[PDB]
Design a protein around this ligand. Structure first.
Ligand SMILES: *[C@@H]1O[C@H](CO)[C@@H](O[C@@H]2O[C@H](CO)[C@@H](O[C@@H]3O[C@H](CO[C@@H]4O[C@H](CO)[C@@H](O)[C@H](O)[C@@H]4O)[C@@H](O)[C@H](O[C@@H]4O[C@H](CO)[C@@H](O)[C@H](O)[C@@H]4O)[C@@H]3O)[C@H](O)[C@H]2NC(C)=O)[C@H](O)[C@H]1NC(C)=O
Ligand SMILES: *[C@@H]1O[C@H](CO)[C@@H](O[C@@H]2O[C@H](CO)[C@@H](O)[C@H](O)[C@H]2NC(C)=O)[C@H](O)[C@H]1NC(C)=O
Ligand SMILES: CC(C)CCC[C@@H](C)[C@H]1CC[C@H]2[C@@H]3CC=C4C[C@@H](O)CC[C@]4(C)[C@H]3CC[C@]12C
Ligand SMILES: *[C@@H]1O[C@H](CO)[C@@H](O)[C@H](O)[C@H]1NC(C)=O
Ligand SMILES: *[C@@H]1O[C@H](CO)[C@@H](O)[C@H](O)[C@H]1NC(C)=O
Length: 1788
């Protein structure tokens, strides 16, 4: 058992080693694939990003100055990496150090001090009293001194103007300006025709200044934009007037220039020539006032000396420089604010005019967003209590509304300042908040009393390694390609071993399929394990899968190799061709891998039971395991032994078991064309009996085979000798019979029988890539011989074979057919087998190797029980010692050759070579004589039988010169007799005939290649159906801003400073009956979301034993309230950090708010740390369960706490000091007072928003605005039906975006075009494979032999190919015109596409014609042509992606590229015309224009023409004195030596064409055509009449027989029937000379005689024939004038008898008498040339050379010694023709 496994493994290893061409590619392909993989890996490094927070943005309602400050500097998401103070629950600042805020606060302080100041009036009163020592003078002076000291302190304590002037002077190197502006504004981390060109050049410089050009993108729609709204309802007018007030709040700088121009001369003369200033300067310099100023300064800067130097200066810094600087600053700020359009309000009547005006303003490049209301009628009614409004803005400034989420999840806070922040810099949130605040103010009356801020939630220290994810979630493809190559190789090997019938012989040799499958398994698993180990090595070292144990991945790859090995064992039993299976395995495994990518996209609704029932394949389970590996690898923890993956391994093992069972079943139920689906002479007792059959029978005989005799076994192959020989072997069991083979019953023991019983079937067994010595060694080891015994047997076999040389012993299977057959028949004798069963030896080999094999067989006659079974007569005659014939399953005759020939055989055959005279002489010499047959220069007679022989031969030899007889001959009866006795318009005719034949061969192929019609149909159907799934990619529907667009989310509300001031009522109205927003309130005014009504429970989730450790780890202050968390340590790359328990610290109270979501109170908790830890831990827990984790929370609120005095003070100040009512003084003061009172906020809210949700910030802003509105509502009936809804609907796209979408749709266009190109390329594949089938010596050369004019052949082929491509063209046209694809079904795009497909077919059908020329194998050009067509399609797709002019000019040669570009340009022009019609114009550029489409049509047409021409061109490519005369009726058989070039001479020697007929050596018939139609087509091509064609066909079908099977498929016939059809084809036209070649190959008796009779008859009609073969019996029975060709020249010619007598050997005699030596002694003494050819018991044979002319005396001596030697039987024969042939071949 095990030794056989060892031999099988050795054979497999030798097959692997000797190739030296497959294993190197096998080891290089995975290396190359994964080298490309690692090269791609080393190009994308892992991106690490620290955790950070984002500053809070301020809306316009929270103050104009903080809003502008938030716009200006902190507009980039700086990613602080540390919690900003803005995220603190109490403070909302971060502008502590803002010098502008300090300047404004100092200005407010100066104002409020001046209005409460009395120094001016006190100084005036003191001056009046002094002008009108004293008593009250001292008190007045003291009060004035104190007042002026306080004023000096106040004026010096501002400290803001100093920094402002220093910074503006330093500004008037790249980073210094940025640092200065950042320190100034906040803390520390064609247009020239419209307006004046000054600020045009300013904005040009802003766009060209080398800084972050993002602040300009945010400031452009703010100071240049322009808004417009719905019809002029008075309430809409009121809300727009409120918005206008909010806008003009910042217009204080507009009327400041007039104020300065009006106040400058007054303050100038006040500081120049006023008595008050002179008195102040006088009092500032004294002897006692200096100490007063020193005491009042409190040691501050700007002492009294500096004050006196600055103020008192009539002619180094006085007030004049400050005055000039302030004047210049005012000039600059006025010139800046001049072109700032603060009147951006335009009322519009209708919505269509709204859209038109917005588009016009967009063309004018000055257009901000636009509000659209929903008023019911232009009435004075205030509001319908529920405002629905939309904000229409440009697309490039608003986030798209077609999607609300990125889809696939990926780490990253999504905080890019420009790419995904359009709701901030675009101005959407600003206008939204302004409109909501205006609506709130107009509904109730409260002005602002509310601030709003936006805070982005932080992110917990993530890293970006998307490449690792996409490569570990798509591992199977590149993990499987190399094994696809490996499985193709192993399938090629398996099917090659199975096709050659080697497995059948292995089974016959005494083996079971189990050990073969095991050996194949081991031999294919060893290199797969090697490759798996190497891949584990290259993956671990590649740094692409760190922290992954090599052992577990190695075991995984080993199980994968095992399951793929069993899968290929499954797939191999369905194919019976090596290359076909090797090419189809790859595509079949690709098809089996596709379900994985098909199921991975629909993972949202896939069931575990569906996963199991779909895991019946190997690639899907491997992909699941790889997904497990990826999920456990991405987080850095790796994969280890931790007890999914186990389920995947179990499913893979179940798949292995299922594949094994499927193999075990299919190998038995459906095998190949060779498997089995589930007058008796004296018996010589001188030798031992080896095989004794006894009463053998089957389902609808007894012989005794002996040891030393080579017994023959003849039969009709239908009545026996086929199932009897199989029953003698182990193929089929017996049926009520027994046969003791060498003393062992067949049914008793079959193992010991096969141990000493060789076999040699017709199909030789010789493995390729091996030596004959290794063959003998392997067969001897399989026999069971020892080492020394095997060596001795190999030496003996090499000595007896005849090739004892290293040039042949160490060479591969390269010898000629002769030595190959000799070695194959000698192999059956290795091991010393005592019983051998041959089958058809020397079937089609030359007579020389036949004699050699005969000698080799006779050398093994010393007791081996050779059982011959052949259809040849001479072989079984000269080899068979006991001929036995059976018929009707019963034994008929048995005995020696002489016994069978003299018991029932006819008399002698006497021939004469060159008629009534000789006939009468023979009749007078012998009465029972007759004239058998007379041929050209020959005559035969029969002597049916004895002294008449002597007298007749004497009379013949005496009167020989009388007649024309030149030589005589005598022969015995051959065994074949005993076997038979016992059991012009011709061009149009050829055109229509070819068309008819091809039409029939296409019609009768319904079961055949009919898929070439429905397969392109189903593929184009799949394509056009998939084309109806991709969205139009250019739509933006009306989206409603509501936070519940996401299914589930966690909200939260944090109430800071709970003192009931202004926050408690707001937070209450946020969580009352109306809920969060507009979800459900007296109905559900939101579609597809009715709110869950019943839930009210303020509870805390059950906490595990972590509160314990939280208690024992006390002192958890506000700072560090929870244990820390580590992330991204060195050499440990973690996608998301892992934190210990107690991440948040305490589960907050959870409660549902009846809106399909749950809120948790976060009062007094650190919001940032809690959010970070909860988010990271929840995301980890969610991704742990393989759910494709989505987002968790989106938004929350933090409500906290941060006037008329300044307004009243400004009013009182304006009342005095030269009050007036001009448009320069009152306007500026009122605007400044409004700006001052529009900056204070009592209470505020901070909306925490996640940016992963595209529509989260706006929805939560709407929610908080609705909450504010419902809270500010007073004494209402109920807050239910009071609410606002915000919509987002962009405007229509313009020409630019239309061009962009027409450019980006080309991807889907080429995607749908590629599959059509692939599906349309399957029609010419059938044509080319049919041409290949007809090209290999079948019909092309045969039709070329007759007059066919080969150009007409290709012409008719092209015609039918066009006519047959017409059908699927119209079919697919109808199929995908049924679909409403306006790009194709239009009245202007249908004919162009129609003739585009037509010309594509016309150009593609001749392109694959020359590919059939050099291709000597059928049924495999299909796959390679499909592959190269796919490659051309990929090339055309790449060229379309894109020097382009020459590219599109030279790439028009490929018709696939032509059709692709045609479809692309067609859909492009369709989309362009549709867009132009949408915009309101009309373009009618026809697709048939020469430049666009039509150049491709002409190119494809001329390409088809030139391809047909070059195909015609390729076909045309632009012996020693052979002399013989063939008269009428001369069968001039021209034999030759081995390799004499008979086929070449036949092809050279072949009006003359029409006068010659050919019969191919190989069968030539269409497998799907009919029998009668073959000869009908060949008669049509011969030149017979159209009406007599049926008569000629009937004559041809009746002449050669087979009339019972005349109407059937030629492919379903047999060898004899195929040869009959072939020889009938050569007579359908009736030429004078018919050239035949091997008419009988593998045929049977009672059928060869039929063809021989037909040949003799067609010769007898005066028509000479010419044939050649190897069987010399056929030549001697058919030919009449031989022509032997030794080396190029005719070495011998003449009749058969003349050649047999001239150069032939002597006669041969056989005598029959235990025995006596005296008879042999007398026989040897009688003849001098007697030679003992064979000596047996009671039977002798001898040869007489050079003594044939004395046959009369030979017969006389025989008749004399008949009574003396007591001989029982005599026989005398002449030398056969095969002896003459082997003699001529020996002396060469
Ligand atoms: C909620 O919970 C978070 C943490 O989960 C708390 O945030 C912590 O508190 C501060 C932010 O509010 C952070 O303090 C900063 O730490 C920086 C780190 O630099 C080193 O810090 C270590 C101590 O950990 C020192 O030994 C080193 O010498 C380094 O200084 C400081 O650099 C930073 O100092 C600032 O520097 C800037 C620029 O120079 C100055 O302008 C500024 O005035 C200040 O000096 C500052 O001290 C703290 O790191 C942060 N994280 C942790 C783990 O503590 C929140 O505070 C909690 N919420 C509330 C309301 O408390
Ligand atoms: C809306 O506000 C703008 C300014 O914010 C007002 O326009 C002012 O008045 C006229 C034009 O109407 C101009 O001469 C002024 O220069 C504009 N600006 C200022 C600062 O006065 C406009 O009148 C307002 N419209 C409504 C309906 O209130
Ligand atoms: C035209 C004048 C009278 C009205 C404007 C007030 C300006 C000019 C006065 C009022 C207060 C003064 C400032 C108060 C003190 C300082 C701090 C010192 O380190 C630089 C000078 C500086 C900054 C003074 C410059 C001049 C000053 C800014
Ligand atoms: C900065 O913050 C502190 C809080 O410690 C506050 O007292 C101060 O007024 C702030 N500065 C401002 C608002 O300019
Ligand atoms: C804008 O697009 C809508 C969508 O159908 C269309 O009805 C409307 O007429 C378009 N308006 C303009 C001005 O193109």
């Amino acid at each position: 058992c095990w030794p056989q496994l060892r031999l099988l493994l050795w054979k497999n290893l030798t097959f692997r080693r000797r190739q030296t061409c497959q294993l190197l590619l096998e080891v290089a392909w995975p290396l190359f694939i994964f080298l490309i993989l690692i090269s791609v890996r080393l190009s994308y490094p892992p991106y690490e990003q620290h955790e950070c927070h984002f500053p809070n943005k301020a809306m316009p309602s929270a103050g104009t100055l903080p809003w502008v400050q938030g716009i200006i500097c902190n507009a980039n998401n700086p990613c602080f990496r540390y919690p900003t103070p803005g995220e603190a629950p109490g403070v909302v600042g971060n502008f502590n150090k803002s010098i502008v805020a300090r300047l404004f606060s100092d200005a407010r302080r100066l104002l409020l001090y001046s209005q409460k100041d009395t120094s001016m009036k006190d100084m005036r009163k003191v001056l009046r009293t002094l002008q009108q020592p004293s008593k009250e003078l001292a008190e007045a002076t003291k009060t004035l001194l104190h007042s002026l000291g306080t004023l000096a302190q106040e004026l010096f304590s501002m400290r803001s103007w100093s920094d402002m002037r220093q910074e503006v002077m330093f500004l008037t190197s790249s980073t210094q300006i940025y640092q200065a502006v950042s320190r100034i504004v906040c803390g520390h981390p064609f247009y020239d025709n419209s307006t004046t060109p000054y600020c045009n050049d300013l904005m040009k410089n802003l766009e060209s200044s080398p800084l972050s050009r993002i602040i300009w993108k945010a400031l452009k729609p703010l100071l240049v934009g322009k808004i417009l709204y719905t019809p002029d309802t008075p309430a809409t007018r009121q809300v727009m007037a409120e918005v206008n007030k909010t806008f003009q709040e910042l217009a204080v700088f507009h009327d400041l220039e007039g104020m300065w121009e009006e106040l400058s001369p007054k303050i100038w003369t006040f500081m120049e020539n006023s008595q008050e200033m002179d008195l102040v300067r006088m009092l500032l310099d004294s002897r006692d006032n200096d100490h007063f100023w020193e005491q009042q300064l409190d040691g501050l800067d700007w002492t009294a000396q500096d004050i006196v130097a600055f103020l008192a200066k009539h002619p180094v810094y006085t007030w004049r420089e400050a005055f000039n600087e302030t004047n210049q600053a005012i000039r600059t700020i006025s010139r800046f604010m001049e072109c700032v359009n603060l009147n951006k309000l335009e009322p519009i009547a209708t919505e269509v005019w709204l859209i038109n005006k917005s588009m016009e303003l967009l063309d004018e490049r000055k257009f901000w967003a636009g509000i659209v209301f929903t008023g019911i009628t232009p009435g004075s009614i205030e509001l319908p209590h529920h405002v629905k409004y939309k904000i229409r803005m440009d697309i490039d400034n608003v986030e798209r509304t077609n999607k609300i989420k990125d889809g696939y999840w990926d780490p990253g806070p999504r905080a890019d300042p420009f790419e995904d922040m359009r709701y901030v810099w675009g101005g959407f949130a600003y206008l939204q908040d302004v409109v909501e605040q205006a609506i709130i103010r107009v509904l109730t009356g409260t002005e602002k009393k509310t601030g709003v801020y936006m805070q982005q939630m932080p992110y917990p220290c993530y890293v970006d390694d998307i490449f690792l994810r996409v490569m570990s979630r798509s591992m199977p493809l590149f993990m499987t390609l190399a094994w696809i190559y490996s499985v193709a190789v192993i399938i090629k090997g398996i099917v090659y071993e199975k096709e050659a019938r080697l497995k059948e012989t292995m089974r016959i040799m005494g083996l079971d399929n189990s050990i073969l499958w095991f050996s194949w398994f081991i031999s294919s698993l060893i290199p797969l394990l090697v490759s798996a180990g190497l891949l584990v090595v290259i993956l671990k070292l590649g740094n692409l899968l760190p922290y992954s144990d090599p052992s577990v991945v190695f075991v995984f790859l080993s199980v994968f190799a095992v399951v793929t090995i069993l899968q290929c064992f499954l797939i191999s039993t369905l194919f019976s061709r090596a290359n076909l299976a090797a090419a189809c395995g790859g595509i079949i495994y690709f098809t089996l891998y596709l379900p994985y990518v098909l199921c991975v996209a629909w993972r949202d609704y896939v069931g575990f039971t569906l996963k199991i029932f779909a895991s019946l394949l190997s690639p899907v389970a491997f992909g699941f395991g790889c997904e497990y590996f990826a999920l456990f690898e991405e987080q850095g923890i790796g994969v280890q032994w931790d007890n999914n993956l186990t389920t995947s391994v179990s499913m893979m093992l179940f798949d292995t078991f299922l594949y094994g069972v499927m193999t075990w079943y299919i190998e038995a139920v459906f095998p190949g064309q060779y498997g089995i689906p589930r007058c008796m002479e004296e018996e010589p007792t001188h030798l031992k009996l080896g095989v004794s059959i006894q009463n053998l029978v089957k389902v609808y005989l007894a012989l005794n085979f002996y040891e030393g005799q080579i017994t023959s076994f003849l039969g009709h192959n239908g009545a026996g000798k086929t199932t009897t020989m199989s029953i003698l072997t182990g193929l089929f069991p017996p049926t009520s019979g027994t046969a003791y083979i060498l003393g062992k019953d067949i049914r008793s023991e079959m193992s010991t029988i096969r141990q000493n019983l060789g076999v040699c079937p017709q199909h030789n067994v010789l493995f390729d890539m091996l030596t004959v010595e290794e063959h003998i060694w392997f067969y001897a080891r399989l026999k069971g011989l020892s080492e020394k015994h095997v060596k001795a047997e190999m030496e003996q076999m090499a000595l007896d074979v005849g090739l004892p040389s290293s040039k042949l012993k160490s060479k591969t299977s390269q010898l000629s057919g002769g030595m190959q057959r000799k070695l194959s028949v000698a192999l059956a004798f290795v091991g010393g087998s005592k019983v051998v069963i041959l089958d058809e030896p020397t079937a089609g080999v030359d007579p020389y190797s036949r004699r050699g094999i005969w000698e080799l067989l006779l050398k093994y006659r010393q007791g081996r029980t050779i059982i011959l079974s052949t259809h040849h007569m001479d072989e079984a005659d000269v080899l068979g010692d006991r001929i036995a014939i059976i018929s009707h399953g019963k034994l008929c005759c048995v005995g020696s050759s002489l016994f069978l020939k003299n018991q029932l055989g006819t008399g002698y055959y006497l021939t004469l070579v060159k008629v009534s005279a000789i006939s009468n002489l023979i009749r007078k010499h012998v009465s029972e004589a007759r004239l058998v047959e007379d041929i050209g220069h020959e005559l035969t007679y029969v002597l049916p039988y004895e002294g008449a022989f002597v007298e007749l031969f004497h009379e013949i030899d005496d009167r020989l010169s009388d007649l024309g007889i030149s030589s005589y001959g005598i022969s015995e009866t051959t065994l074949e007799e005993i076997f038979l006795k016992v059991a012009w318009k011709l061009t149009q005719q050829q055109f229509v005939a070819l068309l008819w034949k091809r039409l029939l061969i296409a019609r009768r192929s319904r079961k055949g290649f009919f898929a070439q019609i429905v397969l392109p149909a189903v593929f184009v159907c799949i394509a056009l159906v998939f084309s109806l799934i991709v969205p139009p990619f250019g739509k933006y529907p009306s989206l409603e801003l509501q936070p519940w667009m996401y299914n589930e989310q966690y909200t939260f509300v944090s109430n800071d400073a709970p003192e009931d001031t202004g926050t408690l009522e707001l937070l209450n109205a946020l969580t009352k009956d109306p809920g969060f927003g507009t979800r459900c309130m007296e109905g559900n005014p939101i579609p597809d979301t009715p709110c869950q009504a019943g839930e009210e429970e303020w509870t805390t989730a059950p906490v595990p034993q972590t509160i314990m450790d939280l208690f024992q780890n006390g002192n958890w202050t506000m700072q560090n309230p929870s244990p820390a968390c580590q992330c991204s340590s060195d050499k440990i790359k973690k996608m998301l950090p892992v934190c210990p328990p107690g991440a948040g610290g305490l589960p907050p109270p959870q409660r549902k708010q009846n809106t399909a979501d749950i809120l948790q109170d976060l009062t007094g908790r650190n919001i940032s740390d809690y959010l970070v830890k909860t988010y990271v831990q929840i995301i980890a827990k969610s991704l742990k369960n393989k759910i494709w984790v989505n987002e968790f929370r989106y938004g929350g609120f933090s409500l906290g706490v941060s006037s008329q005095e300044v307004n009243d003070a400004i009013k009182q100040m304006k009342k005095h000091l030269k009050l007036a009512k001009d448009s320069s003084a009152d306007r500026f003061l009122n605007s400044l007072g409004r700006f001052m009172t529009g900056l204070d906020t009592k209470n505020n809210v901070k909306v925490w928003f996640n940016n992963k949700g595209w529509h989260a910030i706006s929805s939560f802003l709407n929610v908080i605005n609705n909450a504010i509105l419902r809270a500010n509502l007073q004494k209402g009936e109920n807050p239910s039906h009071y609410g606002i809804t915000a919509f987002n609907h962009p405007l229509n796209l313009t020409k630019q975006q239309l061009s962009e979408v027409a450019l980006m749709t080309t991807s889907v266009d080429v995607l749908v075009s590629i599959c059509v190109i692939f599906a349309m390329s399957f029609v010419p594949a059938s044509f080319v494979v049919f041409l290949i089938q007809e090209r290999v010596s079948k019909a092309k050369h045969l039709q070329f032999i007759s007059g066919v004019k080969p150009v007409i052949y290709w012409l008719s082929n092209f015609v039918w190919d066009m006519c047959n491509y017409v059908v699927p063209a119209t079919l697919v046209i109808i199929i995908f015109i049924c679909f409403q694809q306006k790009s194709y079904v239009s009245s202007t795009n249908l004919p162009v596409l129609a003739l585009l497909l037509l010309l594509y077919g016309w150009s593609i059908t001749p392109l694959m014609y020359p590919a059939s020329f050099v291709f000597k194998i059928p049924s495999t050009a299909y796959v390679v042509l499909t592959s190269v067509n796919l490659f051309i399609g990929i090339n055309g797709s790449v060229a379309t992606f894109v020097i382009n002019d020459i590219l599109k000019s030279v790439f028009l040669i490929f018709p696939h590229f032509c059709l692709g570009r045609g479809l692309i340009d067609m859909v492009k022009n369709q989309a362009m015309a549709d867009a132009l019609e949408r915009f309101g114009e009309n373009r009618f550029v026809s697709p048939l224009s020469w430049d666009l489409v039509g150049r491709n049509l002409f190119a494809m047409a001329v390409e088809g023409v030139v391809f047909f021409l070059i195909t015609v061109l390729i076909q045309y490519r632009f012996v020693d004195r052979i002399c013989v005369g063939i008269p009428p009726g001369e069968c001039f058989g021209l034999l030759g030596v081995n390799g004499a070039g008979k086929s070449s001479t036949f092809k050279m020697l072949t009006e003359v064409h029409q006068n010659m007929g050919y019969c191919p050596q190989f069968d030539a018939i269409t497998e799907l055509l009919t029998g009668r139609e073959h000869v009908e087509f060949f008669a049509l091509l011969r030149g017979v009449p159209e009406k007599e064609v049926g008569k000629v066909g009937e004559w041809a079908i009746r002449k050669l027989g087979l009339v019972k099977y005349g109407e059937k498929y030629a492919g379903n016939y047999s060898g004899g029937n195929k040869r009959k059809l072939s020889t009938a084809m050569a007579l359908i036209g009736g030429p004078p000379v018919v050239f035949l070649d091997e008419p009988t190959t593998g045929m049977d008796p009672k059928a060869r005689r039929f063809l021989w009779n037909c040949a003799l008859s067609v010769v007898k009609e005066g028509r000479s024939v010419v044939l050649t073969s190897h069987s010399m019996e056929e030549c001697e029975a058919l030919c009449t004038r031989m022509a032997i060709m030794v080396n190029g020249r005719f070495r011998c010619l003449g009749s058969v008898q003349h050649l047999k007598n001239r150069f032939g050997d002597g006669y041969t005699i056989v005598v029959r008498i235990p025995d006596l030596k005296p008879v042999q002694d007398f026989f040897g003494l009688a003849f001098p040339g007697s030679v003992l050819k064979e000596k047996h018991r009671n039977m002798l044979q001898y040869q007489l050379p050079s003594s044939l002319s004395s046959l009369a005396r030979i017969f006389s001596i025989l008749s004399q010694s008949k009574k003396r030697l007591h001989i029982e039987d005599y026989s005398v024969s002449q030398t056969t023709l095969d002896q003459v042939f082997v003699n001529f071949a020996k002396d060469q």
